[PDB]
Amino acid sequence: KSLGDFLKRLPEQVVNKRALESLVKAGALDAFGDRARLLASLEPLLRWAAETRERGRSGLVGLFAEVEEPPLVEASPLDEITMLRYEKEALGIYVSGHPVLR
Amino acid sequence: HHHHHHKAGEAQDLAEGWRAFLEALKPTLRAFVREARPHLEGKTLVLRFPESKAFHHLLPLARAQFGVEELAFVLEKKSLSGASPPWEAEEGEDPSEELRRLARLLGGRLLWVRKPKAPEAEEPVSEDGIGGNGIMPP
DNA sequence: TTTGTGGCACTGGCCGTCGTTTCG
DNA sequence: CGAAACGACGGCCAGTGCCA
Lengths: 102, 138
What we know:
This is part of a larger assembly, with chains A and B.
Chain A: H1 3-9, H2 17-26, H3 35-40, H4 42-56, H5 80-91
Helix pairs in contact in A: 1-4, 2-5
Chain B: H1 2-5, H2 36-41, H3 48-56, H4 59-63, H5 106-112, H6 127-135
Chain A binds a DNA duplex through residues 13, 16, 18-19.
Region (Disordered) (chain B): 113-135
Function (chain B): DNA polymerase III is a complex, multichain enzyme responsible for most of the replicative synthesis in bacteria. This DNA polymerase also exhibits 3' to 5' exonuclease activity.
Protein name (chain B): DNA polymerase III subunit gamma/tau
């Protein structure tokens, strides 16, 4: 349902911060927001995701074991040149447009 | 909730106005309001879902008992705004007094002052370049 | 032969285990 | 004498570089 729902559910143990970055860059998480906004919100929501577990890992359940995800931390939209540069990094090929077509 | 997901910086921050359907800005919630209206509806139809909220007291359930008689923004295009060596030049007002061409440029000029140049800033292409061209038929 | 590609080995970053040293 | 807590180190995974 969200980036937070993705982080608290799949821990850093499994999907590490290095993997999460390119997963945003490749476009796998585009259904939750802007790439720049998502990338920025990684480490804050990661701390929040790790914080949600220890609430459940010492009593509590949901309402008191989870202060629901905060809004996505704001950032400027990426330009196509630096956006398509991340797609090549994340997928090994210029997926979805070539920088020259701008 | 698909429009809330598209959020990019302050873009959807200044998007509830573009809908609009508010009351003189913001009575009740850190709106959007269009996130409480589908929740009231629920799923797609479904009568338990519309009813639920109705028993306690998409678009026309909202029209029933809600703050509507105010009118702020319109489109979808309306704006407003979202307020709640060569350079220009000469000087500068606006409207422009050295360039520029003649539609939707003043608006840019209007926005501009001041005072960096370049820089370029999103990302390219023209602006300094065009200025250069004019300093160029001096 | 001068180019690209697919497999496999090497480094670094993080993580979790084990062993030692200290304190009670 | 035994428990704990801190630091070392392996290895594991991944990102890379090479060579066939």
